[PDB]
Amino acid sequence: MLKYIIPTIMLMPLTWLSKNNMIWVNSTAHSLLISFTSLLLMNQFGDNSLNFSLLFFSDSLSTPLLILTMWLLPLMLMASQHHLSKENLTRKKLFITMLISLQLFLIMTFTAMELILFYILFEATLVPTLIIITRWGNQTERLNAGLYFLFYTLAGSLPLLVALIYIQNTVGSLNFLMLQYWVQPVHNSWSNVFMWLACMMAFMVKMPLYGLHLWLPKAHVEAPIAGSMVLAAVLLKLGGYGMLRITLILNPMTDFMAYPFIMLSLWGMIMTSSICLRQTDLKSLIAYSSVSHMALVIVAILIQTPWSYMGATALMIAHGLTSSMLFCLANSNYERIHSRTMILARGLQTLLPLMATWWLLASLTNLALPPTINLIGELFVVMSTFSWSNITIILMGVNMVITALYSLYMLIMTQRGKYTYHINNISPSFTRENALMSLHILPLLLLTLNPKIILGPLY
Amino acid sequence: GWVRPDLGDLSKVTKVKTDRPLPENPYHSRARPEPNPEVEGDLKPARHGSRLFFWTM
Ligand SMILES: CCCCCCCCCCCCCCCCCC(=O)OC[C@H](COP(=O)(O)OCCN)OC(=O)CCCCCCCCCCCCCCCCC
Ligand SMILES: CCCCCCCCCCCCO[C@@H]1O[C@H](CO)[C@@H](O[C@H]2O[C@H](CO)[C@@H](O)[C@H](O)[C@H]2O)[C@H](O)[C@H]1O
């Protein structure tokens, strides 16, 4: 992985040694070049994962997440450089450094072969993320949002640290390849019930699981746009990726420990979808949309079927691009009217016709219009949960209906109707804003032509 | 014919011949516990280094 780790680090010298007026051009261009080379990770085999060294390996699960992560860095740079224009030069370079360091921790997190190396990097992403939210957020509440984000995560992570170290003691290793062959079954006992909880609660909080999700709408509403992009696109998927790996050693206890969390997700997804119908804040609506989508991922990981794992892998990638696009779309409105109130600026399709096309495409992927990968992921999950229990189609069906209602409600309220009279600073969409939107939707729609590369190890 | 010893004579350490056998275990000592088995051999590099978690050295 050094062909990706090292050039990612070299982005830091590049940013700091760039001319004062070229920090965005240089960092954006060279982070796109790194994104290009990440496609070499798709040298995947039918039987064996791609194991580079004792430290790093890349299978079909981590490969698409790595490519999503490295694609997101250039997009985040494009999305931030407007609202950071008045920033002090050094504080602009420190902002970019926080994003580069986040990418560094992320690509190492997704390829760590040892679970305790995964834990440290998994935890290391907190610091740059927290600093972005609290230093470069705009509102007073960004400070409270930082604390909720920090302490929700740590409340779960610290038990996970104890469980992993206990697992290394008893099994002798935490290398994920070794665990595949040395895994022993988990037999019922209160001791194992809490080993199971410690291994899964840290990841449940990151997804987040319904009930434990309150940190997420706070963080999104306060984060800067680049922070919201990485939060929704990648950092949520650290929970999913971690769960997909650790469940290997939790069998067969996962048979009955899953029930309380499937119930929370199946019911929680209807509850958070319905919350979206009455949200007044556009960013908060998108945040609650992520909770509903990630509920499906939690259910799919817990029912442990080949179809559900394929569906979860596609959902994580599809959600990553769609939710990131939606936050970017809402941000472009915010940079004009400087409010997140959804009902404030209406009828924008009249004033920004092409940006209204992006709003349409983003909404269609969010409601999972076939054959988007949003629909492929969501459909595969629904097929597998139906076999788990037929009655789940009722809850899946209702969520699909409510998901369409709030997706098109967001489209209709902001883009259609009459424009707000007194709002007269809706300038024409910039090239930067249109290119940012297209760099989200075009790769998302292109992946429909070749969806096998985002279906994960069980394809 | 008794001669008085000189100053320093009676404080001399003298040798005495005896036909009594020297005691073997005057303290009545028990047998001393055996020492811990000595660790000997050629110091080789640690196998695969520290082996602490993920570290490869
Ligand atoms: C620190 C870089 C990562 C930054 C992100 C932070 C990640 C989380 C940090 C927590 C610790 C996790 C570190 C994980 C790696 C440690 C395990 C390891 O790397 O193996 C032992 C390592 C030898 O590595 P080895 O596999 O043998 O490869 C040899 C290549 N010549 O031997 C070692 O342990 C030392 C290696 C430490 C890794 C950094 C040092 C690498 C050498 C580059 C130093 C810079 C040299 C250039 C100087 C520029 C001056 C301007
Ligand atoms: C979000 C929170 C989710 C909470 C989920 C709760 C799951 C509850 C699981 C309960 C079953 C635990 O597993 C159960 O534990 C006891 C440990 O005493 C084991 O049984 C053992 O202790 C009991 C004492 O009660 C003895 O009678 C028994 O002889 C002994 O073997 C059982 O063999 C095992 O079946």
For residue A165, the chain B residue with the least C-alpha distance is: B53
A191: alpha, beta or left? (left if phi > 0; alpha if psi -120 to 50): alpha
Residue A97 and residue A12 in contact, taking contact as beta carbons nearer than 8 Å:
yes
> If you ran DSSP here, which 8-state letter would residue A454 be given?
G
Single out the residue of A185, A30, A159, A27 nearest to residue A99, CA to CA.
A27
User: What is the three-class DSSP state of B46?
Assistant: coil
Both tokens of A12, joined, read: 């830091």
> If you ran DSSP here, which 8-state letter would residue A175 be given?
B
Residue A319 and residue A293 in contact, taking contact as beta carbons nearer than 8 Å:
yes
CA separation (Å) from A149 to A197, A204, A227, A320?
20, 14, 12, 19
Separation CA A106–CA A126 (nearest Å):
11
Separation CA A61–CA A237 (nearest Å):
11
Residues 6+ apart with CB under 8 A from A385: A299, A300, A303, A308, A392, A393, A396
Separation CA A238–CA A204 (nearest Å):
10
Separation CA A277–CA A279 (nearest Å):
6
Helices (H), A259-303: 259-276, 282-303
Separation CA A217–CA A214 (nearest Å):
6
Question: Between chains, do B53 and A116 touch, taking CB under 8 Å as contact?
Answer: yes
Q: How far is ligand 2, taken at its centre, from the CA of residue A187, in Å? A: 10
Single out the residue of A377, A215, A243 nearest to residue A301, CA to CA.
A243
Separation CA A415–CA B16 (nearest Å):
123
Q: Give me the residue label for tokens 């002798």.
A: A172
Task: Give chain A's length.
Answer: 459
B2 lines ligand 1 (CB under 6 A): no
Single out the residue of A297, A209, A303, A184 nearest to residue A255, CA to CA.
A303
Separation CA A175–CA A57 (nearest Å):
11
Residue A341 phi, psi (nearest 5): -65, 120
User: What is the three-class DSSP state of A172?
Assistant: coil
Distance, C-alpha B23 to centroid of its chain = 18
How many beta carbons lie within 10 A of that of residue A1, not counting itself? Answer: 19
**Residue type for position A111:** T
Residue A228 and residue A328 in contact, taking contact as beta carbons nearer than 8 Å:
no
Separation CA A347–CA A368 (nearest Å):
24
Residue A62 and residue A135 in contact, taking contact as beta carbons nearer than 8 Å:
no
Residues 6+ apart with CB under 8 A from A163: A195, A198, A199
Distance, C-alpha A44 to centroid of its chain = 23
Q: How far is ligand 1, taken at its centre, from the CA of residue A403, in Å? A: 46
A211 lines ligand 2 (CB under 6 A): no
Interface A:B, Cβ pairs < 8 A:
14
Single out the residue of A119, A380, A120 nearest to residue A246, CA to CA.
A119
Residue A197 phi, psi (nearest 5): -65, -45
| Residue B55 touches chain A, beta carbons under 8 Å | no
Both tokens of A97, joined, read: 């450094």
Residue A448 and residue A371 in contact, taking contact as beta carbons nearer than 8 Å:
yes
Both tokens of B40, joined, read: 């000997």
Residue A81 phi, psi (nearest 5): -65, -10
Q: What is the DSSP string of A351-390?
A: T-HHHHHHHHHHHHHHTT-TTSHHHHHHHHHHHHHHHH-T
Both tokens of A69, joined, read: 């992560």
Q: Considering only CB atoms, which chain A residues are within 8 Å of B53? A: 114, 116-117, 168, 174
Separation CA A50–CA A284 (nearest Å):
39
Residue A288 phi, psi (nearest 5): -65, -25
Q: Which residue owns the Cα nearest ligand 2 atom 31?
A: A189
Separation CA A395–CA A74 (nearest Å):
38
Q: What angle do CA A411, A417, A423 make, to 5 degrees?
A: 95
How many beta carbons lie within 10 A of that of residue B15, not counting itself? Answer: 4
Separation CA A59–CA A48 (nearest Å):
8
Separation CA A204–CA A314 (nearest Å):
19
Q: How far is ligand 2, taken at its centre, from the CA of residue A249, in Å? A: 19
Q: Which residue owns the Cα nearest ligand 2 atom 13?
A: A189
Q: How far is ligand 1, taken at its centre, from the CA of residue B4, in Å? A: 90
| Residue B27 touches chain A, beta carbons under 8 Å | no
Q: Which residue owns the Cα nearest ligand 2 atom 28?
A: A189
Q: Which ligand is nearest to the CA of A5?
A: 1
Q: Considering only CB atoms, which chain A residues are within 8 Å of B52? A: none
Which of A188, A192, A194 for mutating ligand 2's site (highest number of atoms within 8 Å of CB)? A188
User: What is the three-class DSSP state of A135?
Assistant: helix
E strand or H helix at A32: helix A23-37
Question: Between chains, do B54 and A116 touch, taking CB under 8 Å as contact?
Answer: yes
Distance, C-alpha A413 to centroid of its chain = 26
Residue A112 phi, psi (nearest 5): -65, 125
Residues 6+ apart with CB under 8 A from B22: none
- Backbone interruptions in chain A following residues (C to N > 2.5 Å): none
Burial A301-317 (b: 16+ CB within 10 A, else e): bbbbbebbbbbbbbbbb
Q: How far is ligand 1, taken at its centre, from the CA of residue B55, in Å? A: 10
Both tokens of A8, joined, read: 């990612």
Task: Give chain B's length.
Answer: 57
A191 lines ligand 2 (CB under 6 A): no
The resolution, in Å, is: 2.3
Separation CA A237–CA A319 (nearest Å):
10
Question: Between chains, do B53 and A54 touch, taking CB under 8 Å as contact?
Answer: no
Q: What is the DSSP string of A229-248?
A: HHIIIIIHHHHHHHHHHHGG
Both tokens of A7, joined, read: 């050039």
Could you tell me the end-to-end alpha-carbon distance of chain B, in angstroms, rounded to an integer?
Answer: 90
Helices A115-124 and A126-136, packing angle to 10 deg: 10
Burial A345-376 (b: 16+ CB within 10 A, else e): bbbbbebbeebbebbebbbbbbbbeeebbbbb
Handedness of CA A451, A456, A457, A458 (dihedral sign): negative
Both tokens of A357, joined, read: 């096309």
Q: Around A312, how many Cα atoms within 13 Å sit in the side-chain half-sphere?
A: 34
How many beta carbons lie within 10 A of that of residue A25, not counting itself? Answer: 13
Q: Give me the residue label for tokens 């590369």.
A: A453
Burial A218-239 (b: 16+ CB within 10 A, else e): bbbbbbbbbbbbbbbbbbbbbb
Residues 6+ apart with CB under 8 A from B4: none
E strand or H helix at A87: none
User: What is the three-class DSSP state of A298?
Assistant: helix
User: What is the three-class DSSP state of A413?
Assistant: helix
Q: Considering only CB atoms, which chain A residues are within 8 Å of B57? A: none
